[PDB]
C-alpha cells in the first residue's frame, strides 16, 4: 500500500543476464494502486505509465518528461510544519524515483537530472520562504532544460556542421533527435549529402529518422543492420547518437551501435558520436552484460508467412528470448565526440566531467 | 605595423637565430605587433592581430605558425576577460607576453632533460626528417655518457634527413641514412622511434613531415615504441578524421599555393593517429596523448 | 533488555559541544549518525562541514559503523535537527571527548548493571535511577559526565 | 626522548625495508610511512616550510634507497610533500590550489609562479598534521571503497581470471560473491605460489574456484570473460609493475579482447615513469627457480628469478580505485593532483 508493489518478472531469462529485471509491457504497475493517486504523485504515476508502455522513448525526451513531472510535483508541495524543505523534498522524491525505476530502468540522462535536482534542493537555505524556494527550483529546472539540452543541441549542431562535407554519404543508426537535428540543419545551411539509415528489430526506431529526413528533403537510403557490411563501402562517415558516455570513454548506446562501429572500423570509415555533456557519467562498463535493460521478450516474435515462429515460446523449457536494449562501444572504436564544448577525443570524457564538477 | 614590416620582422627573427622555431618567431612578431599597435579597443586589436596572423600564415604554411597565432589570440582574450580597462589590459599583455617569450625560449632544454632518460644504453633510434628538438634530446643523451646508434630517413624531397645526419655526425654519434622505402626493412633493428612534430592535434595525434604516418604504422606492426617530442605552443585545436581531413593550407607550401605526370602536388605533412603514439615529451612534462586534449579543454572554456 | 537512558541530564546537546556519534547511514546532505551520549538520537554530519579541503565523496572520510567526535553547530529542538561538524573538532577536543565518553559509558554500564540486578523493566525506572545517583553528582559538581565519574571514584575508598 | 626514539624507529624501518618486510601489506607500509613522517614533522625542529621539506626529502631518500621496489614509501613521502606545499600555499595567500602547482597551458599563458618557502607560519604544523590524519582516515577505508564496486563489474555465471594473491582483489571478489555466482580461475604465479592461497580463501567463501599453472594461461583464456588482477605499482603513464607472469596474462587477454581490470588503491600510484633506472625488476635468489640440490649443473647455468613484470598501459582496460573507475588514459591527471612535479625525484 504505502510502498508500491514490486513489478513481477515476465519469463525465464538468459543465465548470463539473470541479474537484470525483465518485464512485460502488458503487465503494468498501476493495477494495484489507488486511482486518486495517493501514495505517488499523479504526475509521476502518469509518467511511469508512459515509460512502461514505451510511449516516451529517447534520452532527451525521457529526461524532459521527467523534469516536467518533477516541476509539477514541486509546484504541489507543502512543507510539513516540523520539517525543512531541503530534507523533506529530497526524502519525498525518492519513492517517486523508485516507482519510475520499477516502470522502466532509468536512462543516464534521467539519473543525471535527478542528481542535479537533488543537489539543487539540498542547497536551499532554511530561511527561504516556501513559495520562494519552489519558484527558485522551478526556475532552476527550466534553466537546466534550456542550457543542457536546447542550447547544447544548437552548439553541437554548429560544431558538427564543419565535419559534414558536400557529396558525403553519412550512415546513421536508429533514432536520435540530436543526429536528426544535425542533419536537418546541415541540409538547410546548404550542404548536399546522402544519408543511409540503418534500422534493427524490434523497435525499428530508424524509421522515425527516415521520415524526418524526407520532410527535410534529404536523400535517404534505408536498410537493416545485417546488411550494413554491404553498404559501408559507399559510406564516408558514420554518425551515431549516444545515450551515455562513460568515464572510461565507452559509448553506451542502442544495441548494435558497437556492431556498426566495429564494421565501420573494418571498412576504414570514421565514426563520430554526438552527445550532450549532461549525459556524461562517472560509471564505467567493460561490457554489455554487467548493466543493461531487458525489454519485453515477446517483442522478438515476428510474422513471417502464415505461421508465427516463437509463438508460445514459453512452452519450450530450453528456449530463451534475449531482447537486449543497450550496448557498450569501447573507446578504441570511436574516432570523435562532438559536444557543446567542441570536438574532443573519446578519452576526454573524464576531464569534461571534472570541468563540469569544479563549478558544482 | 604594416604587412610588409611584419613579414620583414618575422623573416629577420628567423634569420638571426637559425635554431629558433617558426612558431616562436611568429609569437615574438605578434608581440611586437601588439607593442606597436595604436588602437584603443579590444576588438580592433583582435582584428588587427587576426590580420597579422593571416599574413604570417601566408608567409609560412607550417602548422606551428598557425598554432602559435591561435595561442596568442587566446592569450590576449584571456587578458581581456579579466581586465575591462584597455590601458591596463595592454600593459599586462605586454608584461605577460615578455614572460611568455622568456618561458617558451626554454622548452627545448626541458624536453631534452625529460626525454634523454628514455634512451637505453646500447640502443638503436630511428628518426624521420630533421628536428631540432630531437637533436637536442640526442645531445642530452650523449652528454649523459650514453652510446647509441641512429638511423635517419632521407625524407624526400628536401632531403632534410641528410642534414640531420650531418648534425648528428657533428656530435660523434654513429648515424646511418636510409631510404624512406627502407623504413619497413629497418624497423626490426630500431629499439625505439623518436620524431618531432609540426603540430599536436586535439585527439593527441600529430601532424608531421610526410612519411611519419607509415613509420608509425610500421612501428605499431612490430610493437616498437613511438615517441614524439614537441613544445606546448605546437598544440592545435584541429580534429582531422583521415589524411584528407587535414587542411590543404598545411599540406602544400606557401609558394606552391591531371592523370598524366600530375603527381597531385605531393603533400608535405601527414596525420598520425594517437593510437600509434606511445608518449609525448613536451615542456609540460611527459604526457600520454589523451593529456594533450586536456591542456586545450582547460585552455578554452 | 533494551533499557537505555541518556548519559547526561539534559535531553539535547548545545552548540559548540563536542559529542560522540556513530555513523549509521549516508545521505545527500551528509551522514546520518546517532548521538551515543543522548540515547541514540538522530543527527547529520554535513557534507560541507566534513573537511577543510575540497572533498569529492563523503565515503572518502566517513565509514558506516565508525565512531566520531563532532562539534554541534545547530540545534532545533522543535524539528529534531542536530547538525554536526567534523572540520571544527581539534585533536585535543577529540581526546577530551573520548575521555568524557569513556567515563560516562562506565557510569552508564554501572547503573545499567544495577538496574538489571534490580530487575528493572522500563526506561522510566532507569531514568529515575540516573536522577537519584548520577545527575545529582553531575549538577552538584557543575560538571556533566566528569562529576558523576569523580563521585563514583570517591566511593569504594 | 624525541630524537633517541625517532632515530631508532627510522633505523628499524629502514632495516626492515632492507632485509625483509614481514607479512606487512601495502596498506600497512603506507600507514607506517605516514606515521614516521608525522612523527618527523612533530618532533624535529623546522623553522619554515623549506627546512621541513628538505628534511622530509632527506629522510625519504634514505627510506626509498632502502628498497626501491617498495614504491609505497616513496608515494607516501611525496604525498606528504604535496600536502606541505598545499598548506603553505594556502597560508601564503594563493587562493585556489592544486591547479597552479602543475604546469598548464592556461597557467603558462596567464602568468606563472615564483615559489618561496622561506616565510614562517605558526599554524602550518597543525594544518599539516590534520591533513596527514585525513590521509590516514582515507587509508583506513580505501579497501572497503574499492570492494563496494564489485557488483558493477561482475555479471551472473561469469568466468574471472586472476593471478597471484591480491588482498584487494580477494575482497572485491568476496563482496561480489554475496549476491552473484561466478567461476574464478587463479594462476599459481610460480615460483612463489601465492595463487594457491588465493584459491583456498576464495574456496572458503563458496566461490567456484580453479587452480592452474602459469603455462595454461593462454589455453584457458579463450573461455575467460573477465580478468581482475592486483598490482604493486601504477606508473605515471598507466603502466603496471605487477607480479611476474602478469604481462603474459595481459597479452593473452588482449588477444581475445578480454577486459583487464586492475583493482588498486590510490597510494599505489607512483609518479615515476618507466624510462629505465635499471631498478624495475626485483631479482630474488635463484633457489626458488632451480634448487641448490641440482649439483654441478649450477656452475655453468645462469638462473634468473625476476619477481615483477612490466605491463604497458595498452593492455589495461580499467583501473578501479577507492575514487571509482578510470581509464588508463586518465592516470596522468591523478598524478598531477596527488604529487608535485618538483618532488618526482627525491
Swiss-Prot record, chain A:
GO CC term, one of those recorded: eukaryotic translation initiation factor 2B complex
Molecular functions (GO terms): guanyl-nucleotide exchange factor activity; translation initiation factor activity; translation initiation factor binding
Keywords: Acetylation, Cytoplasm, Disease variant, Initiation factor, Leukodystrophy, Phosphoprotein, Protein biosynthesis
GO biological process, alphabetically ordered: cytoplasmic translational initiation; myelination; oligodendrocyte development; ovarian follicle development; regulation of translation; response to glucose; response to heat; response to peptide hormone
Annotated compartments: Cytoplasm, Cytosol
Effect of residue 302 to R: In VWM4; with ovarian failure
Major place of residence: cytoplasm
Illness the protein is tied to: Leukoencephalopathy with vanishing white matter 4: An autosomal recessive brain disease characterized by neurological features including progressive cerebellar ataxia, spasticity, and cognitive deficits. Brain imaging shows abnormal white matter that vanishes over time and is replaced by cerebrospinal fluid. Disease severity ranges from fatal infantile forms to adult forms without neurological deterioration. The disease is progressive with, in most individuals, additional episodes of rapid deterioration following febrile infections or minor head trauma.
Protein family: Belongs to the eIF-2B alpha/beta/delta subunits family.
Protein name: Translation initiation factor eIF2B subunit delta
Organism of origin: Homo sapiens
Gene designation per UniProt: EIF2B4
Residues of the full protein shown: 164 to 523 of 523
Swiss-Prot record, chain B:
Keyword Protein biosynthesis: yes
GO molecular function: guanyl-nucleotide exchange factor activity; identical protein binding; translation initiation factor activity
An example Gene Ontology CC term for this record: membrane
Residues carrying N6-acetyllysine: 35
GO biological process, one term: translational initiation
Compartments (UniProt record): Cytoplasm, Cytosol
Main location (coarse class): cytoplasm
Keywords in alphabetical order: Acetylation, Cytoplasm, Disease variant, Initiation factor, Leukodystrophy, Protein biosynthesis
Role, per record: Acts as a component of the translation initiation factor 2B (eIF2B) complex, which catalyzes the exchange of GDP for GTP on eukaryotic initiation factor 2 (eIF2) gamma subunit. Its guanine nucleotide exchange factor activity is repressed when bound to eIF2 complex phosphorylated on the alpha subunit, thereby limiting the amount of methionyl-initiator methionine tRNA available to the ribosome and consequently global translation is repressed.
Family note: Belongs to the eIF-2B alpha/beta/delta subunits family.
Name the UniProt record assigns to this protein: Translation initiation factor eIF2B subunit alpha
Organism: Homo sapiens
Lineage: Eukaryota, Metazoa, Chordata, Craniata, Vertebrata
Curated annotation (Swiss-Prot), chain C:
Post-translational modification: Phosphorylation at Ser-48 and Ser-51 stabilizes the eIF-2/GDP/eIF2B complex and prevents GDP/GTP exchange reaction, thus impairing the recycling of eIF-2 between successive rounds of initiation and leading to global inhibition of translation, while concomitantly initiating the preferential translation of integrated stress response (ISR)-specific mRNAs. Substrate for at least 4 kinases: EIF2AK1/HRI, EIF2AK2/PKR, EIF2AK3/PERK and EIF2AK4/GCN2. Phosphorylation on Ser-51 by the EIF2AK4/GCN2 protein kinase occurs in response to amino acid starvation and UV irradiation. (Microbial infection) Phosphorylation by vaccinia virus protein E3 and rotavirus A stabilizes the eIF-2/GDP/eIF2B complex and prevents GDP/GTP exchange reaction, thus impairing the recycling of eIF-2 between successive rounds of initiation and leading to global inhibition of translation.
Inducing factors: Up-regulated upon endoplasmic reticulum stress.
Modified residues (Phosphoserine): 48, 51, 157
Residue ranges of domain S1 motif in the record: 16-87
Modified residues (N6-acetyllysine): 140
Subcellular location(s) per record: Cytoplasm, Stress granule; Cytoplasm, Cytosol; Mitochondrion
Effect of residue 51 to D: Mimics phosphorylation; promotes relocalization to the mitochondrial surface in response to mitochondrial damage
Signal peptide: none
Protein family: Belongs to the eIF-2-alpha family.
Record's protein name: Eukaryotic translation initiation factor 2 subunit 1
Native source species: Homo sapiens
Record gene name: EIF2S1
Included stretch of the parent chain: 2 to 158 of 315
From Swiss-Prot, chain D:
Cytoplasm as UniProt keyword: yes
Segments forming a coiled coil: none
Keyword Transcription regulation appears in the UniProt entry: no
Regulation of its function: Activated by the chemical integrated stress response (ISR) inhibitor ISRIB which stimulates guanine nucleotide exchange factor activity for both phosphorylated and unphosphorylated eIF2.
GO biological processes: central nervous system development; cytoplasmic translational initiation; myelination; oligodendrocyte development; ovarian follicle development; regulation of translational initiation; response to glucose; response to heat
GO-annotated molecular function: ATP binding; GTP binding; guanyl-nucleotide exchange factor activity; translation initiation factor activity
Keywords carried by this UniProt record: Cytoplasm, Disease variant, Initiation factor, Leukodystrophy, Protein biosynthesis
SUPFAM superfamilies associated with the record: NagB/RpiA/CoA transferase-like
A Pfam family this chain is assigned to: IF-2B
Record's subcellular location: Cytoplasm, Cytosol
Annotated effect of mutating residue 166 to F: In VWM2; with ovarian failure
Cellular component aspect of the GO annotation: cytoplasm; cytosol; eukaryotic translation initiation factor 2B complex
Domain of life: Eukaryota
Protein family membership: Belongs to the eIF-2B alpha/beta/delta subunits family.
PANTHER family linked to this entry: TRANSLATION INITIATION FACTOR EIF-2B SUBUNIT BETA
Protein's name according to its UniProt entry: Translation initiation factor eIF2B subunit beta
Gene name in the database record: EIF2B2
Amino acid at each position: 500500500r504505502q510502498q508500491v508493489p514490486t513489478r513481477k518478472d515476465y519469463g525465464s531469462k538468459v543465465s548470463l543476464f539473470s541479474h537484470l529485471p525483465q518485464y512485460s509491457r502488458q503487465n503494468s504497475l498501476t493495477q494495484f494502486m489507488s486511482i486518486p493517486s495517493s501514495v505517488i504523485h499523479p504526475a509521476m504515476v502518469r509518467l511511469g505509465l508512459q515509460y512502461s508502455q514505451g510511449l516516451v522513448s529517447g534520452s532527451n525526451a525521457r529526461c524532459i518528461a521527467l523534469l516536467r513531472a518533477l516541476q509539477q510535483v514541486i509546484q504541489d508541495y507543502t512543507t510539513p510544519p516540523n520539517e525543512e524543505l531541503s530534507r523533506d523534498l529530497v526524502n519525498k522524491l525518492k519513492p517517486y524515483m523508485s516507482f519510475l525505476t520499477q516502470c522502466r530502468p532509468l536512462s543516464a540522462s534521467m539519473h543525471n537530472a535527478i542528481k542535479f535536482l537533488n543537489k539543487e534542493i539540498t542547497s536551499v537555505g532554511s530561511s527561504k520562504r516556501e513559495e520562494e524556494a519552489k519558484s527558485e527550483l522551478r526556475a532552476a529546472i527550466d534553466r537546466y532544460v534550456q542550457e543542457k539540452i536546447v542550447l547544447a543541441a544548437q552548439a553541437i549542431s554548429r560544431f558538427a556542421y564543419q565535419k559534414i562535407s558536400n557529396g558525403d554519404v553519412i550512415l546513421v543508426y536508429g533514432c536520435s533527435s540530436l543526429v536528426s537535428r544535425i542533419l536537418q540543419e546541415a541540409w538547410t545551411e546548404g550542404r548536399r549529402f546522402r544519408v543511409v539509415v540503418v534500422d534493427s528489430r524490434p523497435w525499428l526506431e530508424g524509421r522515425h529518422t527516415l521520415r524526418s529526413l524526407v520532410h527535410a528533403g534529404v536523400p535517404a537510403s534505408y536498410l537493416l543492420i545485417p546488411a550494413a557490411s554491404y553498404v559501408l563501402p559507399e559510406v564516408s562517415k558514420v554518425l551515431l547518437g549516444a545515450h551515455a558516455l562513460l568515464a572510461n570513454g565507452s559509448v553506451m548506446s542502442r544495441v548494435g551501435t558497437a556492431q556498426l562501429a566495429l564494421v565501420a572500423r573494418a571498412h576504414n570509415v570514421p565514426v563520430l558520436v554526438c552527445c550532450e555533456t549532461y549525459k556524461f557519467c562517472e560509471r564505467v562498463q567493460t561490457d554489455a552484460f554487467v548493466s543493461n535493460e531487458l525489454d519485453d521478450p515477446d517483442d522478438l516474435q515476428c510474422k513471417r508467412g502464415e505461421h508465427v515462429a516463437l509463438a508460445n515460446w514459453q512452452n519450450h523449457a530450453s528456449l530463451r528470448l534475449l531482447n537486449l536494449v543497450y550496448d557498450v562501444t569501447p573507446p578504441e572504436l570511436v574516432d570523435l565526440v562532438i559536444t557543446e564544448l567542441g570536438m574532443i577525443p573519446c578519452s576526454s570524457v573524464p576531464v569534461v566531467l571534472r570541468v563540469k564538477s569544479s563549478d558544482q | 605595423m604594416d604587412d610588409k614590416e611584419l613579414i620583414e620582422y618575422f623573416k629577420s627573427q628567423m634569420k638571426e637565430d637559425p635554431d629558433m622555431a617558426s612558431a616562436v618567431a611568429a609569437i615574438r612578431t605578434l608581440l611586437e605587433f601588439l607593442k606597436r599597435d595604436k588602437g584603443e579597443t579590444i576588438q580592433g586589436l583582435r582584428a588587427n592581430l587576426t590580420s597579422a596572423i593571416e599574413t604570417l600564415c601566408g608567409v609560412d604554411s607550417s602548422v606551428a605558425v598557425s598554432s602559435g597565432g591561435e595561442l596568442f589570440l587566446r592569450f590576449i582574450s584571456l587578458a581581456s576577460l579579466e581586465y575591462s580597462d584597455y590601458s591596463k589590459c595592454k600593459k599586462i599583455m605586454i608584461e605577460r607576453g615578455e614572460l611568455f617569450l622568456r618561458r617558451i625560449s626554454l622548452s627545448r632544454n626541458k624536453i631534452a632533460d625529460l626525454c634523454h632518460t628514455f634512451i637505453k644504453d646500447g640502443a638503436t633510434i630511428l628518426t624521420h626528417a630533421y628536428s631540432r628538438v630531437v637533436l637536442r634530446v640526442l645531445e642530452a643523451a650523449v652528454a649523459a655518457k650514453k652510446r647509441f646508434s641512429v638511423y635517419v630517413t632521407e625524407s624526400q624531397p628536401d632531403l632534410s634527413g641528410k642534414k640531420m645526419a650531418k648534425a648528428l655526425c657533428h656530435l660523434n654519434v654513429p648515424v646511418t641514412v636510409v631510404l624512406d622505402a627502407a623504413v619497413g626493412y629497418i624497423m626490426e633493428k630500431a629499439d625505439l622511434v623518436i620524431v618531432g612534430a609540426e603540430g599536436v592535434v586535439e585527439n593527441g595525434g600529430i601532424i608531421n613531415k610526410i612519411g611519419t604516418n607509415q613509420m608509425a604504422v610500421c612501428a605499431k606492426a612490430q610493437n616498437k615504441p613511438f615517441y614524439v617530442v614537441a613544445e606546448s605552443f605546437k598544440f592545435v585545436r584541429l580534429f582531422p578524421l583521415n589524411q584528407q581531413d587535414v587542411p590543404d593550407k598545411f599540406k602544400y607550401k606557401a609558394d606552391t599555393l591531371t592523370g598524366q605526370d600530375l603527381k597531385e602536388e605531393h603533400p608535405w605533412v601527414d596525420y598520425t593517429a594517437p593510437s600509434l603514439i606511445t608518449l609525448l615529451f613536451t615542456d609540460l612534462g611527459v604526457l600520454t596523448p589523451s593529456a594533450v586534449s586536456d591542456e586545450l579543454i582547460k585552455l578554452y572554456l | 533488555p533494551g533499557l537505555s537512558c541518556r548519559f547526561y541530564q539534559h535531553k539535547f546537546p548545545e552548540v559548540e559541544d563536542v559529542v560522540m556519534v556513530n555513523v549509521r547511514s549516508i545521505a545527500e546532505m551528509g551522514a546520518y549518525v546517532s548521538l551515543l551520549e543522548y540515547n541514540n538520537i538522530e543527527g547529520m554530519i554535513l557534507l560541507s562541514e566534513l573537511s577543510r579541503r575540497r572533498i569529492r565523496s563523503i565515503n572518502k572520510l566517513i565509514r558506516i559503523g565508525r565512531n566520531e567526535c563532532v562539534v554541534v553547530i545547530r540545534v532545533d529542538k522543535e524539528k529534531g535537527y542536530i547538525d554536526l561538524s567534523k572540520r571544527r573538532v581539534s585533536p585535543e577536543e577529540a581526546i577530551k571527548c573520548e575521555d568524557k565518553f569513556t567515563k560516562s559509558k562506565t557510569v552508564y554500564s554501572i547503573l545499567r548493571h544495577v538496574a538489571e540486578v534490580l530487575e528493572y523493566t522500563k526506561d522510566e525506572q532507569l531514568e529515575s535511577l540516573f536522577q537519584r545517583t548520577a545527575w545529582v553528582f553531575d549538577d552538584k559538581y557543575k560538571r556533566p559526565g566528569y562529576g558523576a565519574y569523580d563521585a563514583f571514584k570517591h566511593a569504594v575508598s | 626522548a624525541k630524537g633517541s626514539e625517532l632515530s631508532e624507529r627510522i633505523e628499524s624501518f629502514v632495516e626492515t625495508l632492507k632485509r625483509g618486510g614481514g607479512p606487512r601489506s601495502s596498506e600497512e607500509m603506507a600507514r607506517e610511512t605516514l606515521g614516521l613522517l608525522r612523527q618527523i614533522i612533530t618532533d624535529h625542529r623546522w623553522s619554515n616550510a623549506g627546512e621541513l621539506m628538505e628534511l622530509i626529502r632527506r629522510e625519504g631518500r634514505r627510506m626509498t634507497a632502502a628498497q626501491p621496489s617498495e614504491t609505497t614509501v616513496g608515494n607516501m613521502v611525496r604525498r606528504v610533500l604535496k600536502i606541505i606545499r598545499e598548506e603553505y600555499g594556502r597560508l601564503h595567500g594563493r587562493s585556489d590550489e592544486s591547479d597552479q602547482q602543475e604546469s598548464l597551458h592556461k597557467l603558462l599563458t596567464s602568468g606563472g609562479l615564483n615559489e618561496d618557502f622561506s616565510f614562517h607560519y605558526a599554524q602550518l604544523q597543525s594544518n599539516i598534521i590534520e591533513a596527514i590524519n585525513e590521509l590516514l582516515v582515507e587509508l583506513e577505508g580505501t579497501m572497503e571503497n574499492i570492494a563496494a564496486q564489485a557488483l558493477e563489474h561482475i555479471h551472473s555465471n561469469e568466468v574471472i581470471m586472476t593471478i597471484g594473491f591480491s588482498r584487494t582483489v580477494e575482497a572485491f571478489l568476496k563482496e561480489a560473491a554475496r549476491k552473484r555466482k561466478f567461476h574464478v580461475i587463479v594462476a599459481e604465479c610460480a615460483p612463489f605460489c601465492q595463487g594457491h592461497e588465493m584459491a583456498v580463501n576464495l574456496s572458503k567463501a563458496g566461490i567456484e574456484t580453479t587452480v592452474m599453472t602459469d603455462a595454461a594461461i593462454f589455453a584457458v583464456m579463450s573461455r575467460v570473460n573477465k580478468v581482475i588482477i592486483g598490482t604493486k605499482t601504477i606508473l605515471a603513464n598507466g603502466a603496471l609493475r605487477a607480479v611476474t607472469g602478469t604481462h603474459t596474462l595481459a597479452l593473452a587477454a588482449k588477444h581475445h579482447s578480454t577486459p583487464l581490470i586492475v583493482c588498486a588503491p590510490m597510494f599505489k600510484l607512483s609518479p615515476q615513469f618507466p624510462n629505465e633506472e635499471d631498478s624495475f625488476h626485483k631479482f630474488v635468489a635463484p633457489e626458488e627457480v632451480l634448487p641448490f640440490t641440482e649439483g654441478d649443473i649450477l656452475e655453468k647455468v645462469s638462473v634468473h628469478c625476476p619477481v615483477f613484470d612490466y605491463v604497458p598501459p595498452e593492455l589495461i582496460t580499467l583501473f578501479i580505485s577507492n575514487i571509482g573507475g578510470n581509464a588508463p588514459s586518465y592516470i596522468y591527471r591523478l598524478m598531477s593532483e596527488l604529487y608535485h612535479p618538483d618532488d618526482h625525484v627525491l
